[PDB]
Design a protein around this nucleic acid. Structure first.
Ligand SMILES: [Mg+2]
Ligand SMILES: [Mg+2]
Ligand SMILES: [Mg+2]
Ligand SMILES: [Mg+2]
Ligand SMILES: [Mg+2]
Ligand SMILES: [Mg+2]
Ligand SMILES: [Mg+2]
Ligand SMILES: [Mg+2]
Ligand SMILES: [Mg+2]
Ligand SMILES: [Mg+2]
Ligand SMILES: [Mg+2]
Ligand SMILES: [Mg+2]
Ligand SMILES: [Mg+2]
Ligand SMILES: [Mg+2]
Ligand SMILES: [Mg+2]
Ligand SMILES: [Mg+2]
Ligand SMILES: [Mg+2]
Ligand SMILES: [Mg+2]
Ligand SMILES: [Mg+2]
Ligand SMILES: [Mg+2]
Ligand SMILES: [Mg+2]
Ligand SMILES: [Mg+2]
Ligand SMILES: [Mg+2]
Ligand SMILES: [Mg+2]
Ligand SMILES: [Mg+2]
Ligand SMILES: [Mg+2]
Ligand SMILES: [Mg+2]
Ligand SMILES: [Mg+2]
Ligand SMILES: [Mg+2]
Ligand SMILES: [Mg+2]
Ligand SMILES: [Mg+2]
Ligand SMILES: [Mg+2]
Ligand SMILES: [Mg+2]
Ligand SMILES: [Mg+2]
Ligand SMILES: [Mg+2]
Ligand SMILES: [Mg+2]
Ligand SMILES: [Mg+2]
Ligand SMILES: [Mg+2]
Ligand SMILES: [Mg+2]
Ligand SMILES: [Mg+2]
Ligand SMILES: [Mg+2]
Ligand SMILES: [Mg+2]
Ligand SMILES: [Mg+2]
Ligand SMILES: [Mg+2]
Ligand SMILES: [Zn+2]
Ligand SMILES: [Zn+2]
Lengths: 149, 69, 114, 50, 60, 91
RNA sequence: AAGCCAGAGGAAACUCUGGUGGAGGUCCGUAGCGGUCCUGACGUGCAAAUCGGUCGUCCGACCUGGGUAUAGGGGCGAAAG
RNA sequence: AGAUCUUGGUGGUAGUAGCAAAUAUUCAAACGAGAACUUUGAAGGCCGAAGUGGAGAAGGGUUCCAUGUGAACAGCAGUUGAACAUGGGUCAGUCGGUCCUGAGAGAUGGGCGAGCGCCGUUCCGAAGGGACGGGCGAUGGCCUCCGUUGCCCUCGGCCGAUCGAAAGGGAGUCGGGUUCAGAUCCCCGAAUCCGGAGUGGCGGAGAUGGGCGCCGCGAGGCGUCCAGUGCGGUAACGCGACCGAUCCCGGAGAAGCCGGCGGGAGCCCCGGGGAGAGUUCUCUUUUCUUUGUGAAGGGCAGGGCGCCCUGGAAUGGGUUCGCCCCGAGAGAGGGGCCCGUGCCUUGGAAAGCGUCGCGGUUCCGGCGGCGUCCGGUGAGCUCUCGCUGGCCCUUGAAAAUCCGGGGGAGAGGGUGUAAAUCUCGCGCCGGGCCGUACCCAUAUCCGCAGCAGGUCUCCAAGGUGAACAGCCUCUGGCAUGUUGGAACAAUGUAGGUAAGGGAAGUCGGCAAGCCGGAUCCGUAACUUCGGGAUAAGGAUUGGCUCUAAGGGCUGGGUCGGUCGCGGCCGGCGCCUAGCAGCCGACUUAGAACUGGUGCGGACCAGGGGAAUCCGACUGUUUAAUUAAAACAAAGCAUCGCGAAGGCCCG
């Protein structure tokens, strides 16, 4: 609720104790239930896989890009959005990407990201057509909608 | 309440230790024996009058045989 | 008609204030406060939407006073998973483990060369 | 209401007990100067504090 | 029927009645009166008559 | 018979909101409420559950797709681009 | 309204007819909510804002109880200080 | 003597205004000093099930209920009272609170702060005080032996105290009787949940069978060896249990709104059979009332299934009101499971009720007779269960709590009338604390009050009718809303009517009036093609007597060729254009007859058209003079910001 992008409930195996870990990814457009996704350095180019941008080709596009190495996804998360890998350089471990706004940004080559666009398509294409549908849309987000000039 | 189908399994519930009393009710077409145990009230229904006559005299001693009429 | 009243102090038509009409031996209509409708368990596969068979559908705390047989089925994963998806997992476990034997032999005939 | 706490009910009990007239024999005491119970409270005329 | 201390529960009321009247009681009910005094309905055992117990208590 | 001449599905909106806004939302509502064929089981039972979520009633397979269409033309060219970059990544 | 069934006219392109269906910040209109006009009643009132008729809306930005949160140059305001 | 002076008292006004919102009272009697108002009876009326009825939540706090008083109060009165006085009244394991979390509140650590303190709620903490497992021992003691106890080994994150709902979640109580006032709480009777059991309370299960040496005519026994933590069905799954920890997985709790169908109940309706009343001037086999079976078990209908087996379908078929379904297994045949609130049964008739009587015990859960029966209906109303859809840039709680499965660490006996163990049947004990009366409103609450205001819900009969509309009625309730009597002046408030004219009135058709329901016709400009539209305009409408049309159930046999006036197999036959009998809803159409042309006869119930301005629309707004053209709105456009950030609090 309050988001255009659907969420994927991925289940991994905990590598240290007998347990099942449940992650909440942002669904990339194309992934389905009962599908394996692979996260790591050795994961290969497939939609939904979470692999570092430093091991990607120079034209691939990503879904949930990290702003910093180590944290979790922070960029291109809203529905239909993506970043693009522009260039790397093996020296100084840097990678330049193109954000959804068109800004070019330099991030570390260890930053992880899902592969593909994020599901939710062109949600903004449909006219709302109704004050009531704008009321319901913002009732799920916050108290900001009826704007007095 | 529990219903008892045949005769001999009513006899040992009648002679059970927690059996407080036995009540004999006569109707137009059957006779009902009701032993009041601790949890349930076991009712055994006999349509034959002479069968109920024999069962009435076959009850264990030391138990109430109160008749309802 | 003879009209009825609530027998408890909850006067609102909430989900726990559900009643049904009953005729007493005294020939009057009264409310009988019903229990909630129980649900059979879903399947642990989380795929097929039907609920399990052979298991009584009651409220969760009723299951404490039920017999063991009434709460499960005589099968592996009985009472927790459907029969259909148990057959699939039995086949899946066998066939993938056979595939492991396939690739182990396949690399074993690969390592015949330096 | 019908639903009350113990503290509220205990409070209403005291206010009930002290809402009674003075005994007749009080007026015969020497140096009495008390005519009636001036702290009487009717449930409709004035309401309780709580 | 007794007027009892407001802090006395059913266990204490039953035990008190049992010892100082030498009777056996079956069950005890309890309400608090609108004046604040607790009142106990103490049902005696079937082999104890409430009428002649109340006689020797002195409330005939 | 043919009950309307041109409004189609947006006849439910009456005269409101303007002709071009009803026309713009007409093609979106047709695709959003349409039943697509499932690519996993072949049955035409894949219908939208929420925005971006598509679900097949037969095989109970849920997929992440577009807001109104099952898959956007953006993601279709993306999946093809990733495949070409993968086959370029190896040799 | 969409969806669906049947029939008819067409060389195709396609078009037409009768049903079915039950959409909608849809219409008439109760309860509810509101408060247009009579500038009616009353105006030392029933009432420190009420009453009568007539009215607006009545599946939705709907009405409403209780529980919470926001406190004075602060709050909150589909905005009238 | 003044200060619209302060406090207190008193006049004229003035026996004046007034005691006029919601139709209404009347007769007789009783008590009593006293009756328009009390009570009883009889009439006439109202509320008319969206109540003036029956019950609750909040709030009140004794107003509840008996008896008495007649001072003051109840704006008249009162013999009455929600007044006054004296007493009495609220009984729980299973109705709530209590328990859980929700939005949120809030300590501790830490940080800040002159300081009371306040920031923060996992953040900057050495935040687990628990555990069957085992070892070291104490032998504590019915020292056989298993229970205590200290330390150690091993395992253990809800990762955060705590509070937060008498409408959310949350195990399990119902039937009858009873009081002046309490009852799902008391009594009677039927159950049921949770917790406990060390000596193990009884059973049953586990679990008690084979092989061989012999004995014994055999049947039946002795010794050894070997198993035995249940069994059945192809399957869905079933059976009365069915060893098992740490750990893991899952389920239930746990889910929006709207639509259309179907099942069940309660109510309503119809035809009879009883019992009791009502009418009888005449008719009326008539009119009215009444005509039960709780929970909890067992069995069976019935509803549902996205469950199984056989088999393999196009000349595609199955099927719904709609849909929809099928080589990923249709149709068909046979099964399995769930729910079972329905019926029968134990409860159960002994109770209850209706009647007709007999006793008395100031005032009996008295006693007795008879009955408590058979059917038919439905787009009917209300609940409830189920199926299937639609809508969302809206996806419609959480946690206590309970359960199933995976795994197999372990445990238990050496063939004993056996062990460990048991979610199986029965038996034993306990369930503490607080609330519980009453009002719940034109008189028990707030509004200074018995104030036309305000204040959250549940149940919901007949007629008419589209209807929870309006109008009338039944069950239930009441006395006209803080007075009565007599008149019927003006002026008024509220309601009507009005000849001829028809807005000439007025700032202005303000107000009032016209229209109005349904059926059949017929509908313009303009238009964003959806609308305009009930456009505009016209006809009909009663009563009575018919006639058509629209259904559902059964049975459709050619025969003794024999005997299980009847049945198995069949020489023996062609309803196959379908009939024959029975049963029952409304609804539509057509016609005749008929009335002083009157007929949506009350009630209900759009005046219409042609334009100009503004706002797109729906919505919102100054509670108490402005509902608008004002605000909002979707749409359009611009601006800032890549988090070391934008905007903002502090
Ligand atoms: Mg604006
Ligand atoms: Mg019944
Ligand atoms: Mg008051
Ligand atoms: Mg109590
Ligand atoms: Mg509307
Ligand atoms: Mg309207
Ligand atoms: Mg307003
Ligand atoms: Mg106004
Ligand atoms: Mg005025
Ligand atoms: Mg101004
Ligand atoms: Mg002076
Ligand atoms: Mg002077
Ligand atoms: Mg006067
Ligand atoms: Mg007057
Ligand atoms: Mg009336
Ligand atoms: Mg009422
Ligand atoms: Mg009274
Ligand atoms: Mg007076
Ligand atoms: Mg008093
Ligand atoms: Mg911890
Ligand atoms: Mg709490
Ligand atoms: Mg509750
Ligand atoms: Mg009462
Ligand atoms: Mg019965
Ligand atoms: Mg089939
Ligand atoms: Mg009887
Ligand atoms: Mg009460
Ligand atoms: Mg009044
Ligand atoms: Mg009032
Ligand atoms: Mg006040
Ligand atoms: Mg009326
Ligand atoms: Mg009047
Ligand atoms: Mg009067
Ligand atoms: Mg005239
Ligand atoms: Mg005229
Ligand atoms: Mg003029
Ligand atoms: Mg003039
Ligand atoms: Mg007018
Ligand atoms: Mg027009
Ligand atoms: Mg006619
Ligand atoms: Mg407007
Ligand atoms: Mg505009
Ligand atoms: Mg105003
Ligand atoms: Mg524009
Ligand atoms: Zn499954
Ligand atoms: Zn599919």
């Amino acid at each position: 609720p309050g988001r255009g992008a659907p969420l994927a409930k991925v289940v991994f195996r905990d590598p240290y104790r007998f347990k099942k870990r449940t992650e909440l990814f942002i669904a990339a457009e194309g992934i389905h239930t009962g599908q394996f996704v692979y996260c790591g350095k050795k994961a290969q180019l497939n939609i939904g896989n979470v692999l570092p941008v430093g091991t990607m080709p120079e034209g691939t596009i990503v879904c949930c890009l990290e702003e910093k190495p180590g944290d979790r996804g922070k960029l291109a998360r809203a529905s239909g959005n993506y970043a693009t890998v522009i260039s790397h350089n093996p020296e100084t471990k840097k990678t330049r990407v193109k954000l959804p706004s068109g800004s070019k940004k330099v991030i570390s080559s260890a930053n992880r990201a899902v592969v593909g666009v994020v599901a939710g398509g062109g949600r903004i294409d449909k006219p709302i057509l109704k004050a009531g549908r704008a009321y319901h849309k913002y009732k799920a987000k916050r108290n900001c909608w009826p704007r007095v000039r | 309440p529990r219903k008892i189908e045949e005769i001999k399994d009513f006899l040992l519930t009648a002679r059970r230790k927690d059996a407080k009393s036995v009540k004999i009710k006569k109707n137009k077409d059957n006779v009902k024996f009701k032993v009041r145990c601790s949890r349930y009230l076991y009712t055994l229904v006999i349509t034959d009058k002479e069968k109920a006559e024999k069962l009435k005299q076959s009850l264990p001693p030391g138990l109430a045989v109160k008749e309802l009429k | 008609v003879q009209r009825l009243t609530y027998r408890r102090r909850l006067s609102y038509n909430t989900a726990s204030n559900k009643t049904r009409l009953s005729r007493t031996p005294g020939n009057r209509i009264v409310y009988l406060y019903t229990k909630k409708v129980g649900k059979a368990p879903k399947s642990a596969c989380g795929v097929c939407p039907g609920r399990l068979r052979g298991v009584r559908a009651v409220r969760p705390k009723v299951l404490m006073r039920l017999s063991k047989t009434k709460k499960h089925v005589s099968r592996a994963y009985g009472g927790s998973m459907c029969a259909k998806c148990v057959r699939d997992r039995i086949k899946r476990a066998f066939l993938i483990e056979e595939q492991k034997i396939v690739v182990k032999v396949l690399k074993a005939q690969a390592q015949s060369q330096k | 209401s019908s639903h009350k706490t113990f503290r509220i009910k205990r409070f209403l009990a005291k206010k009930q007990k002290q809402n009674r007239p003075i005994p007749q024999w009080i007026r015969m005491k020497t140096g009495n100067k008390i005519r009636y119970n001036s702290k009487r409270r009717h449930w409709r005329r004035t309401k309780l504090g709580l | 029927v007794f007027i009892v201390d407001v802090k006395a529960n059913k266990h204490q009321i039953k035990q008190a009645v049992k010892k100082l009247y030498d009777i056996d009681v079956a069950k005890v009910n309890t309400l608090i009166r609108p004046d604040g005094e607790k009142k106990a309905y103490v049902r005696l055992a079937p082999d104890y008559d409430a009428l002649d117990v109340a006689n020797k208590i002195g409330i005939i | 018979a043919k009950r309307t001449k041109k409004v189609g599905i947006v006849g439910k909106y009456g005269t409101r909101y303007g002709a071009s806004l009803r026309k713009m939302v007409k093609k979106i509502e047709i695709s959003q409420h349409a039943k697509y064929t499932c690519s996993f089981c072949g049955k035409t039972k894949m219908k939208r559950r929420a925005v971006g979520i598509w679900h097949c009633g037969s095989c109970m397979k849920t997929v992440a797709g577009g807001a109104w269409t099952y898959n956007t033309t953006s993601a279709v060219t993306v999946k093809s681009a990733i495949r070409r970059l993968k086959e370029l990544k190896d040799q």
